[PDB]
């Protein structure tokens, strides 16, 4: 009967650890530079064979 | 002040609840009108405790107990309503006159 | 296919998934247990 | 009719209206802040920029949203009921706004230090799910009906652990008033916070408040992937903005009650250590002391505004059955045990 | 007085949605049409009007919640008077909490709290 | 550069009287606006308040604006192999809109979007268009800038020396 | 000759401070919060997803996607509209509250694109179904081109006056007769895989 | 005065202190906060971003006034473009091809 | 392109075949990513959508450098490919692989053991192997029922 | 310890009108959902009346418990009734309602002829010693806690037994 409570304890701490792991993985992206290209103030240079308007 | 008007409203509620207790074709509505009657009684108790019992607050305690009893009734039914709907698939109480 | 016994899959064992790290679990559990014991001690001491 | 005291009472009504209007203005401003903060935190943890063009740094984005919803055509359902449709969000926002009457930002910067206190906050916060059910029924939509039923179930599940967690704090502070709770915390300083003395109630209060605010992972009545918009599916114009305000106001009031009940509120001092900075902060009294108290309260509120805004954008969302299981089988017995432990520890005081 | 501010705040809080509705009525245009007023059903035409009729065994926690709300309401005045009185109210409310726990155990074991 | 650059580019400025005076004096106006757009409507709105009706012309598919705007022009609708090639004739756009305007209208304003793609001579013709058609005003977005600034289109096209602002 | 004609109208209003600045501020507010419908049909929606993502951000313009039509200002039609989908598209557009804006993105939404020639169910352009403000050419248009189309839509939105409101409400003319057709119930009743094992019928 | 209030300060000193608090809160600190948000927008770590957002959350009533009267639009690449119709002297000293997060440092922003 | 080239008995050069294998595997990576995104969105997590898009944009950049467009490449041709790989493509793809392995480890750290994700996913849609074979399932659907059936190794 | 006089009387009249409207909505609506929502208005008005008199704890208890009760009532009325039925809309009038209307009017007249004839202010000046509060008990909720804990012990445990048995009976009866 006590072993059931012990198992409930160990299967609760694990969930808290993995929730904290998700939080840490997500919040570690705040220290990384943004990848956003700020169009229209910034424009990505197209490839040498980009297919756009016909000339 | 016109505090006695509250008493008048309580009486009105009682009568209205009483009316809603009789013409009820839905037992959920009958339970709601029972709550209305108990609410009128509680209004009388609270205003009487305000009038005469500013220290002991016996009317307020009685109001709390009446609210507890009303919630106990509201827990017992609609569980009774649940049994009735599981057995008959109908709620209209005036249509059930087998025992007469 | 429901009445056929040859339809039961028999392909060996799947590639095992990565093992698990259990140390931080014990660290979190120790932190929470110490927090609760500190709560007990603090409540008893500050109540007096 | 005495025209000596009548003018005095009229000016007194003006002098109690003035705090109400500045609090309301700050409340709407704070909703704007929470919208901007949620967008920018999501952009930061998703490696984006967020609102940039509506104002200098997206500052005017939420104001633009509000004025757009003001200028958006009010759309009513022909199949459903108009009165319930109009009444629902108003009831929700009224019952959520009524909880700001008792929040102290200082020892006397409280609109009303009602001795009923936090119990009245629970009582008025119980009323909003009736408005959500009214919105779900009046919209005459299956998604709206499901959202209303889910909101009612969520509130039923998570009203009780929050009530018991507030009851334990009130038992510890021996009073239901928020100012009394904050001062009882401030008696022992930084170690006197109820966060250290009541950790179990702290976690259960966080989870229950997140469920009542309907933030993720407890966003089931408004879950966009399961129902199109939940109870807000048929709502257009200013009413959707009302059901948005009410949500962010609930988040703000939950964070404020976290920093009041469990953190020290405006208090920031360590009497057991020779902290020169904390002692010099607590030595200030007057206008500057109240300003520093407001600053401390806002910082502690922003901590538990930052945490759930992150929580929405990190975790997956729960399921209805699992929400009920967590509310009724993991939080309620734990809150009962916390109340029992609080009473057993409080037996030493008397 | 500590409660006239409550009444004024309640009046203002009730007035605010009325002001929002009036401002939307005098600012936003009206362009109603028979397609616009139809109930939204993800594009497709809605069938019969709403209505779900849940099972009873799902919604049997509400009957527990009604009783537990009363129990938690009754526990507050005891906590308010726990310090003025002594262990007498502790013994008094211990039976209340024990009955609450026993009722929770009964609801757990009988399957009322199962979905 | 800073100070003035980082100070208010708010859209409550009193430049609107000067804008209307310039659009009345200089018939053809080149306009420069924020990259994200939406700050041009404050200036076109007052022109529409005076009775001017707008004709939106995209300069990318304009196609030799002389015969596109001031003459009947041949255009071939796109067959997808199911039809033989048909040569349709379209009326002169600005003149059709001019003769079809109500009598109470102040005139027509030709809003030439993305006019940077046009060559020099096309901008010359777009600047000299109001001389041929008296009741036509020309507005051409010739680029983008942090703040809305306008110049005479003849100055940009090269008919007038570019005086320093 | 398919000619054009201006109807008879009155003078606008003219105002000094209140109405003009109120209209300008309303236009600016509707500029920066053009919430899209999150309407996705086909491959172009993937590029729409690329405009929700991190490299090109929807949030810089505001433009938070809202699932319900009642909370959406802009419908950004991404994908071919088949005969089976076109009535649903028109409902979704109609259920959106005024003022509402439409951007036809993709060659399949402007004129049908590759399916303009041999497809027996592709609607050749949603301009036959919904009034389109800005046309966006290109098969998977680059997300920057989508932002440019949204910028042009903002350029047109900021030019609006109060008069445009009475250009937006429908005239709502109707005509009702009996049809003597055959009324039949829906074929798709929702019954599927229930009691399937008893449906053999040898 | 009235019974219940005790040792209240003089109104002129309370007014002066509230005025200096409003001066620091409404027209001094929001400019520094928005400049600290504009500059160092890409140099933030988690702690600096948290404190930036905390200060914005606290001082937003003072930022809501200054925000309509400020623009933070990005500047042209060359520091010679006085006007949108101005031409660069030599179009080679500009820096073209700014990289992004997978292959850029803080110098490329 | 391999239907008619098998009908006409057209051989494919080894370099074109290797380029085809590389492009097919990159497209498989991108498709699995943009499956993981909407899947976790439907579960309730919206951040993994942006997280996959951060690297699917890199895949798009590789495709646009090689084929000329992000999607709708029109790169595969009968009896070969449209054009050879551009200069400096091998090292770029190798660096992408090195970065994407780290990104995949981050995804598995964030998602795989999450308690809410597991409790939403652990016991839904149990499909037998016999049912998977009879229903005509293929790929990850059929392979997730105890069946090791991949048409890359069966058909060579 | 009260509101200003005219404000108090105006609040009394306004909340009484709201209570009358809510009760009439309860007893005139066919839909149990609509009548339940009118009952909620009655509950809110009654809680405001409690706040008006002196009851700041009884009002909160009323709000909490009765709001839970009406939420449960709406759930079980949705679950135990036919289609949504917005068309039902003020159920029809029969003779059996007309006779009971007269009976209830007579009952209300009998009650109000006693309320309007009794000088309720005269009783207040006779119960002087019942209105001398203990000076140490400033908090009214503190007085209600003390008098609930000490004066009423037997009902305090009887209500616990009642709630437990009601919970058990509700679970046993309503189970499928
Ligand atoms: C801020 C707090 C953010 C995390 C709170 C979200 C809810 C939550 O923890 O549910 C996530 C999981 C859901 O866990 C589920 O529900 C029950 C909870 O014990 C049982 O354990 C179930 O078996 C388990 O599957 O909750 C936990 O396991 C407790 C974690 C406590 C974290 C603190
Ligand atoms: C459930 C609530 C959230 C839990 C998880 C929160 C996220 C934890 C942080 C994950 C990202 C780590 C970033 C590492 C930064 C490296 C540089 C640095 O400053 O490192 C210090 C880390 O600096 C920090 O404190 C990181 C910022 C955390 C506060 C912001 C998040 C609030 C939520 C090292 O000191 P420490 O680890 O001892 O500090 C923590 C300790 O408790 C201090 O006494
Ligand atoms: C928005 C958050 C900012 C802080 C809000 C503090 C609360 C508030 O604005 O109200 C108090 C503010 O108190 C003040 O008077 C301060 C005014 C300036 C507030 C600046 C913020 C009321 O306290 P009081 O005792 O004066 O209440 C009225 C009293 O009973 C007489 O009618
Ligand atoms: C005088 C009140 C109007 C006002 O200040 O106008 C601004 C605010 O008015 C509104 O748009 C309405 C909101 C009211 C505040 C609009 O300017 P903006 O902040 O959008 O543009 C400045 C810059 O170019 C970008 O930051
Ligand atoms: C950000 C805004 C600035 C910070 C908050 C300012 C107000 C907080 C300090 C005052 C309220 C809390 C302490 C209560 C005691 C006190 O100092 O009250 C003053 C409350 O002061 C005010 O009335 C408010 C000052 C203006 C509000 C801000 C501008 C005294 O003025 P009085 O009018 O009650 O008495 C003055 C005289 O002797 C006549 O009685
Ligand atoms: C201080 C905190 C005190 C309470 C500890 C936390 C709450 C109990 C932890 C155990 C728990 O959550 O139970 C699990 C594990 O519990 C077990 O040991 C499984 C068997 C359950 C037996 C029937 C229910 C009785 C459980 C009573 C638990 C305590 C009741 C409240 C005590 C305050 C789940 O069981 P279930 O509800 O899914 O079981 C029902 C199922 O059909 C199996 O019968
Ligand atoms: C806050 C209270 C707001 C005021 C409520 C009463 C409004 C004035 C009376 C109008 C009657 C009314 O609202 O009735 C509706 C029902 O009223 C309610 O349910 C509203 C009261 C619930 C208040 C909840 C408080 C908690 C619908 O019935 P109807 O006959 O008017 O409907 C006509 C048609 O079908 C279009 O709807
Ligand atoms: C200033 C006070 C005056 C002086 C007048 C009051 C103005 C006011 C403050 C008006 C209402 C403003 C709110 C306050 C307006 C509505 C704001 C919500 C609150 C807007 C909803 C916008 C979403 C649409 C916001 C959150 C949101 C962000 C996001 O990134 C994603 C992906 C999703 C799905 C979201 O829901
Ligand atoms: S342009 Fe048309 S055919 Fe091409 S992906 Fe988009 S919807 Fe499909």
Short mmCIF file of C-alpha atoms in Angstrom, two decimals, chain D:
data_model
loop_
_atom_site.label_atom_id
_atom_site.label_comp_id
_atom_site.label_asym_id
_atom_site.label_seq_id
_atom_site.Cartn_x
_atom_site.Cartn_y
_atom_site.Cartn_z
CA UNK D 1 -31.98 68.34 2.67
CA UNK D 2 -29.17 70.33 4.29
CA UNK D 3 -27.19 72.45 1.83
CA UNK D 4 -24.06 72.32 3.97
CA UNK D 5 -23.55 68.56 4.15
CA UNK D 6 -25.02 67.87 0.69
CA UNK D 7 -22.15 69.71 -1.01
CA UNK D 8 -19.67 67.94 1.28
CA UNK D 9 -21.13 64.55 0.33
CA UNK D 10 -21.10 65.43 -3.38
CA UNK D 11 -17.41 66.38 -3.16
CA UNK D 12 -16.79 63.17 -1.19
CA UNK D 13 -18.46 61.16 -3.97
CA UNK D 14 -16.11 62.92 -6.39
CA UNK D 15 -13.14 62.03 -4.15
CA UNK D 16 -14.11 58.35 -4.11
CA UNK D 17 -14.84 58.35 -7.85
CA UNK D 18 -11.33 59.65 -8.62
CA UNK D 19 -9.53 56.49 -7.32
CA UNK D 20 -12.05 54.36 -9.21
CA UNK D 21 -11.36 56.08 -12.53
CA UNK D 22 -7.57 56.04 -12.15
CA UNK D 23 -7.74 52.34 -11.20
CA UNK D 24 -9.96 51.61 -14.23
CA UNK D 25 -7.59 53.51 -16.55
CA UNK D 26 -4.63 51.61 -15.12
CA UNK D 27 -6.57 48.35 -15.49
CA UNK D 28 -7.19 48.89 -19.21
CA UNK D 29 -3.59 50.05 -19.64
CA UNK D 30 -2.48 46.84 -17.91
CA UNK D 31 -4.55 44.75 -20.31
CA UNK D 32 -2.67 46.52 -23.11
CA UNK D 33 0.61 45.68 -21.36
CA UNK D 34 -0.28 42.01 -20.96
CA UNK D 35 -1.20 41.71 -24.65
CA UNK D 36 2.08 43.35 -25.70
CA UNK D 37 4.09 41.28 -23.21
CA UNK D 38 2.55 37.99 -24.34
CA UNK D 39 3.24 38.79 -27.99
CA UNK D 40 6.83 39.88 -27.33
CA UNK D 41 7.63 36.94 -25.02
CA UNK D 42 6.23 34.54 -27.63
CA UNK D 43 8.36 36.24 -30.30
CA UNK D 44 11.47 36.10 -28.10
CA UNK D 45 11.14 32.42 -27.18
CA UNK D 46 10.20 31.59 -30.78
CA UNK D 47 13.12 33.67 -32.19
CA UNK D 48 10.93 36.34 -33.79
CA UNK D 49 10.46 40.11 -33.47
CA UNK D 50 6.77 40.49 -32.66
CA UNK D 51 4.78 43.69 -33.17
CA UNK D 52 7.09 46.27 -34.71
CA UNK D 53 5.10 48.53 -37.02
CA UNK D 54 2.10 49.51 -34.85
CA UNK D 55 3.98 52.17 -32.92
CA UNK D 56 7.69 52.33 -32.11
CA UNK D 57 8.13 48.77 -30.83
CA UNK D 58 4.59 47.47 -31.16
CA UNK D 59 3.49 49.53 -28.14
CA UNK D 60 0.32 50.66 -29.92
CA UNK D 61 -0.55 47.17 -31.22
CA UNK D 62 -3.08 46.28 -28.52
CA UNK D 63 -4.60 49.77 -28.68
CA UNK D 64 -4.99 49.27 -32.44
CA UNK D 65 -6.68 45.91 -31.79
CA UNK D 66 -9.07 47.52 -29.31
CA UNK D 67 -10.02 50.39 -31.60
CA UNK D 68 -10.45 47.97 -34.53
CA UNK D 69 -12.81 45.85 -32.44
CA UNK D 70 -14.61 49.07 -31.51
CA UNK D 71 -15.01 49.94 -35.21
CA UNK D 72 -15.87 46.35 -36.19
CA UNK D 73 -19.53 45.64 -36.95
CA UNK D 74 -21.40 44.11 -34.01
CA UNK D 75 -22.70 40.77 -35.30
CA UNK D 76 -25.68 39.08 -33.66
CA UNK D 77 -26.90 35.51 -34.33
CA UNK D 78 -30.29 35.24 -36.01
CA UNK D 79 -30.90 31.67 -34.83
CA UNK D 80 -29.97 32.23 -31.18
CA UNK D 81 -31.00 34.57 -28.38
CA UNK D 82 -29.85 38.19 -28.49
CA UNK D 83 -30.23 38.96 -24.77
CA UNK D 84 -28.08 36.08 -23.48
CA UNK D 85 -25.55 36.83 -26.23
CA UNK D 86 -25.20 40.44 -25.07
CA UNK D 87 -25.36 39.65 -21.35
CA UNK D 88 -22.76 36.84 -21.13
CA UNK D 89 -19.46 38.68 -21.71
CA UNK D 90 -20.71 41.66 -19.69
CA UNK D 91 -21.37 39.38 -16.70
CA UNK D 92 -17.94 37.78 -17.11
CA UNK D 93 -16.09 41.10 -17.26
CA UNK D 94 -18.10 42.55 -14.34
CA UNK D 95 -17.45 39.54 -12.11
CA UNK D 96 -13.76 39.59 -13.03
CA UNK D 97 -13.36 43.37 -12.54
CA UNK D 98 -15.04 43.18 -9.12
CA UNK D 99 -11.99 41.37 -7.72
CA UNK D 100 -9.75 44.44 -8.10
CA UNK D 101 -11.48 46.24 -5.22
CA UNK D 102 -9.43 44.45 -2.53
CA UNK D 103 -5.94 44.30 -4.07
CA UNK D 104 -3.46 46.42 -2.07
CA UNK D 105 -0.57 48.14 -3.84
CA UNK D 106 0.53 49.68 -0.53
CA UNK D 107 -0.50 49.79 3.12
CA UNK D 108 -3.38 52.13 2.23
CA UNK D 109 -3.36 52.12 -1.59
CA UNK D 110 -6.39 49.83 -1.62
CA UNK D 111 -9.82 50.93 -2.85
CA UNK D 112 -11.60 49.02 -0.08
CA UNK D 113 -10.00 46.99 2.71
CA UNK D 114 -13.08 44.85 3.18
CA UNK D 115 -12.69 42.47 6.10
CA UNK D 116 -14.45 39.77 4.08
CA UNK D 117 -11.48 40.11 1.74
CA UNK D 118 -10.41 37.17 -0.39
CA UNK D 119 -13.67 35.30 0.26
CA UNK D 120 -15.53 38.01 -1.65
CA UNK D 121 -12.98 37.63 -4.46
CA UNK D 122 -13.73 33.91 -4.70
CA UNK D 123 -17.47 34.60 -4.56
CA UNK D 124 -17.36 37.15 -7.39
CA UNK D 125 -14.94 35.08 -9.46
CA UNK D 126 -17.39 32.17 -9.30
CA UNK D 127 -19.91 34.17 -11.36
CA UNK D 128 -18.03 34.47 -14.68
CA UNK D 129 -18.56 30.81 -15.79
CA UNK D 130 -22.30 31.47 -15.66
CA UNK D 131 -21.65 34.22 -18.20
CA UNK D 132 -19.59 31.79 -20.27
CA UNK D 133 -22.44 29.25 -20.20
CA UNK D 134 -24.85 32.04 -21.16
CA UNK D 135 -22.63 32.94 -24.12
CA UNK D 136 -22.44 29.29 -25.15
CA UNK D 137 -26.20 28.74 -25.01
CA UNK D 138 -27.16 32.05 -26.61
CA UNK D 139 -24.91 31.65 -29.64
CA UNK D 140 -26.91 28.62 -30.90
CA UNK D 141 -23.69 26.98 -32.11
CA UNK D 142 -22.39 23.49 -31.37
CA UNK D 143 -18.85 24.77 -30.82
CA UNK D 144 -20.19 27.48 -28.51
CA UNK D 145 -22.26 24.91 -26.60
CA UNK D 146 -19.23 22.65 -26.14
CA UNK D 147 -17.10 25.60 -25.02
CA UNK D 148 -19.67 26.71 -22.46
CA UNK D 149 -20.04 23.21 -21.03
CA UNK D 150 -16.25 22.84 -20.86
CA UNK D 151 -15.93 26.19 -19.07
CA UNK D 152 -18.54 25.16 -16.50
CA UNK D 153 -16.78 21.82 -15.92
CA UNK D 154 -13.38 23.53 -15.58
CA UNK D 155 -14.70 26.01 -13.01
CA UNK D 156 -16.48 23.27 -11.05
CA UNK D 157 -13.28 21.21 -10.95
CA UNK D 158 -10.89 24.00 -9.97
CA UNK D 159 -12.92 26.26 -7.66
CA UNK D 160 -12.44 24.05 -4.59
CA UNK D 161 -8.61 23.64 -4.40
CA UNK D 162 -8.23 27.40 -4.87
CA UNK D 163 -10.75 27.98 -2.08
CA UNK D 164 -8.90 25.63 0.29
CA UNK D 165 -5.54 27.19 -0.61
CA UNK D 166 -6.92 30.65 0.18
CA UNK D 167 -8.43 29.23 3.38
CA UNK D 168 -5.03 27.94 4.53
CA UNK D 169 -3.44 31.37 3.98
CA UNK D 170 -6.32 33.03 5.84
CA UNK D 171 -5.84 30.55 8.70
CA UNK D 172 -2.13 31.38 8.84
CA UNK D 173 -2.75 35.13 8.82
CA UNK D 174 -5.86 34.78 11.07
CA UNK D 175 -7.71 37.30 8.85
CA UNK D 176 -9.40 37.39 5.45
CA UNK D 177 -8.27 40.94 4.61
CA UNK D 178 -5.46 41.25 2.07
CA UNK D 179 -3.70 44.05 3.97
CA UNK D 180 -3.62 41.92 7.12
CA UNK D 181 -2.16 39.01 5.12
CA UNK D 182 0.56 41.21 3.61
CA UNK D 183 1.45 42.72 6.99
CA UNK D 184 1.57 39.28 8.62
CA UNK D 185 4.01 38.30 5.88
CA UNK D 186 5.94 41.52 6.49
CA UNK D 187 6.37 40.77 10.20
CA UNK D 188 9.29 38.40 9.59
CA UNK D 189 10.37 40.00 6.31
CA UNK D 190 11.65 37.92 3.41
CA UNK D 191 11.48 34.69 5.42
CA UNK D 192 7.97 35.62 6.54
CA UNK D 193 6.46 35.10 3.10
CA UNK D 194 3.83 32.37 2.94
CA UNK D 195 5.63 30.96 -0.11
CA UNK D 196 8.22 29.28 2.12
CA UNK D 197 5.78 28.28 4.86
CA UNK D 198 3.11 26.92 2.48
CA UNK D 199 4.73 25.46 -0.65
CA UNK D 200 2.02 22.88 -1.37
CA UNK D 201 -0.70 25.52 -1.27
CA UNK D 202 1.53 27.70 -3.45
CA UNK D 203 1.76 25.12 -6.26
CA UNK D 204 -1.92 24.18 -6.00
CA UNK D 205 -2.92 27.86 -6.06
CA UNK D 206 -0.80 28.41 -9.18
CA UNK D 207 -2.37 25.45 -10.98
CA UNK D 208 -5.91 26.35 -9.88
CA UNK D 209 -5.51 30.00 -10.87
CA UNK D 210 -4.12 28.95 -14.25
CA UNK D 211 -7.17 26.74 -14.71
CA UNK D 212 -9.59 29.50 -13.66
CA UNK D 213 -7.87 32.00 -15.97
CA UNK D 214 -8.31 29.31 -18.67
CA UNK D 215 -4.69 29.67 -19.71
CA UNK D 216 -2.91 26.76 -21.37
CA UNK D 217 -2.69 23.82 -20.58
CA UNK D 218 -6.22 24.54 -19.24
CA UNK D 219 -7.54 26.37 -22.32
CA UNK D 220 -10.13 23.69 -23.09
CA UNK D 221 -13.31 25.88 -23.37
CA UNK D 222 -11.50 28.10 -25.90
CA UNK D 223 -9.25 25.43 -27.46
CA UNK D 224 -8.75 26.65 -31.02
CA UNK D 225 -7.71 23.27 -32.42
CA UNK D 226 -10.67 21.30 -31.05
CA UNK D 227 -13.43 23.90 -31.38
CA UNK D 228 -13.10 26.80 -33.81
CA UNK D 229 -13.12 29.45 -31.08
CA UNK D 230 -15.09 27.87 -28.23
CA UNK D 231 -17.71 30.12 -26.68
CA UNK D 232 -16.22 33.03 -28.66
CA UNK D 233 -17.04 31.35 -31.98
CA UNK D 234 -20.08 33.47 -32.91
CA UNK D 235 -18.88 36.61 -31.11
CA UNK D 236 -17.76 39.58 -33.20
CA UNK D 237 -16.88 43.20 -32.59
CA UNK D 238 -16.68 44.62 -29.09
CA UNK D 239 -17.94 41.48 -27.34
CA UNK D 240 -14.91 39.40 -28.37
CA UNK D 241 -12.76 42.24 -27.05
CA UNK D 242 -14.72 42.08 -23.80
CA UNK D 243 -14.12 38.31 -23.54
CA UNK D 244 -10.49 39.05 -24.29
CA UNK D 245 -10.13 41.81 -21.70
CA UNK D 246 -11.85 39.63 -19.06
CA UNK D 247 -9.34 36.83 -19.68
CA UNK D 248 -6.30 39.10 -19.35
CA UNK D 249 -7.83 40.83 -16.32
CA UNK D 250 -8.30 37.41 -14.71
CA UNK D 251 -4.64 36.65 -15.43
CA UNK D 252 -3.55 39.96 -13.88
CA UNK D 253 -5.72 39.56 -10.78
CA UNK D 254 -4.47 35.99 -10.33
CA UNK D 255 -0.86 37.20 -10.49
CA UNK D 256 -1.66 39.99 -8.02
CA UNK D 257 -3.27 37.51 -5.63
CA UNK D 258 -0.22 35.26 -5.99
CA UNK D 259 2.11 38.09 -4.97
CA UNK D 260 -0.24 39.20 -2.19
CA UNK D 261 -1.16 35.88 -0.57
CA UNK D 262 2.08 33.92 -1.02
CA UNK D 263 4.73 36.52 -1.75
CA UNK D 264 5.25 39.45 0.59
CA UNK D 265 3.29 42.01 -1.40
CA UNK D 266 4.93 45.42 -1.15
CA UNK D 267 7.32 44.22 1.57
CA UNK D 268 10.99 43.70 0.71
CA UNK D 269 13.32 43.33 3.70
CA UNK D 270 15.49 40.73 5.42
CA UNK D 271 15.53 41.49 9.18
CA UNK D 272 17.67 38.44 10.04
CA UNK D 273 20.60 39.67 7.90
CA UNK D 274 22.47 42.97 7.74
CA UNK D 275 21.21 43.82 4.25
CA UNK D 276 21.98 47.52 3.90
CA UNK D 277 20.00 47.93 0.67
CA UNK D 278 16.84 46.25 1.99
CA UNK D 279 17.02 48.15 5.29
CA UNK D 280 17.46 51.45 3.44
CA UNK D 281 14.53 50.57 1.17
CA UNK D 282 12.29 49.79 4.15
CA UNK D 283 13.45 52.93 5.98
CA UNK D 284 11.77 55.18 3.38
CA UNK D 285 8.29 56.41 4.31
CA UNK D 286 5.79 58.71 2.67
CA UNK D 287 5.14 59.22 -1.03
CA UNK D 288 8.46 57.61 -1.95
CA UNK D 289 7.74 54.59 0.26
CA UNK D 290 4.39 54.03 -1.44
CA UNK D 291 6.03 54.42 -4.86
CA UNK D 292 8.68 51.82 -3.97
CA UNK D 293 5.95 49.52 -2.67
CA UNK D 294 4.05 49.85 -5.95
CA UNK D 295 7.28 49.12 -7.84
CA UNK D 296 7.95 45.99 -5.77
CA UNK D 297 4.36 44.76 -6.14
CA UNK D 298 4.48 45.29 -9.91
CA UNK D 299 7.81 43.43 -10.21
CA UNK D 300 6.54 40.46 -8.19
CA UNK D 301 3.33 40.49 -10.26
CA UNK D 302 5.38 40.54 -13.46
CA UNK D 303 7.27 37.43 -12.35
CA UNK D 304 4.02 35.42 -12.22
CA UNK D 305 2.88 37.13 -15.40
CA UNK D 306 6.07 36.02 -17.16
CA UNK D 307 5.71 32.42 -15.95
CA UNK D 308 2.19 31.67 -17.34
CA UNK D 309 2.79 33.57 -20.59
CA UNK D 310 5.74 31.23 -21.07
CA UNK D 311 3.58 28.30 -19.93
CA UNK D 312 1.08 28.90 -22.74
CA UNK D 313 3.80 28.79 -25.40
CA UNK D 314 5.72 25.78 -24.00
CA UNK D 315 3.51 22.95 -22.78
CA UNK D 316 0.90 21.00 -24.74
CA UNK D 317 -2.71 21.38 -23.60
CA UNK D 318 -4.60 18.94 -21.40
CA UNK D 319 -7.70 16.91 -22.19
CA UNK D 320 -11.13 17.31 -20.60
CA UNK D 321 -11.06 13.95 -18.79
CA UNK D 322 -7.48 14.53 -17.63
CA UNK D 323 -8.42 18.06 -16.56
CA UNK D 324 -11.20 16.61 -14.40
CA UNK D 325 -8.84 13.95 -13.03
CA UNK D 326 -6.20 16.54 -12.11
CA UNK D 327 -8.78 18.83 -10.52
CA UNK D 328 -10.62 16.20 -8.49
CA UNK D 329 -8.02 13.50 -7.72
CA UNK D 330 -4.65 15.26 -7.46
CA UNK D 331 -5.33 18.84 -6.36
CA UNK D 332 -8.26 18.48 -3.94
CA UNK D 333 -6.82 15.77 -1.60
CA UNK D 334 -3.47 17.55 -1.66
CA UNK D 335 -5.14 20.85 -0.71
CA UNK D 336 -7.01 19.07 2.09
CA UNK D 337 -3.72 17.67 3.38
CA UNK D 338 -2.15 21.13 3.18
CA UNK D 339 -5.04 22.56 5.20
CA UNK D 340 -4.61 19.81 7.80
CA UNK D 341 -0.86 20.52 8.02
CA UNK D 342 -1.57 24.25 8.35
CA UNK D 343 -3.99 23.62 11.22
CA UNK D 344 -1.55 21.25 12.95
CA UNK D 345 1.24 23.82 12.68
CA UNK D 346 -1.09 26.61 13.84
CA UNK D 347 -1.91 24.61 16.98
CA UNK D 348 1.51 25.72 18.28
CA UNK D 349 0.60 29.42 18.04
CA UNK D 350 -2.28 29.43 20.54
#
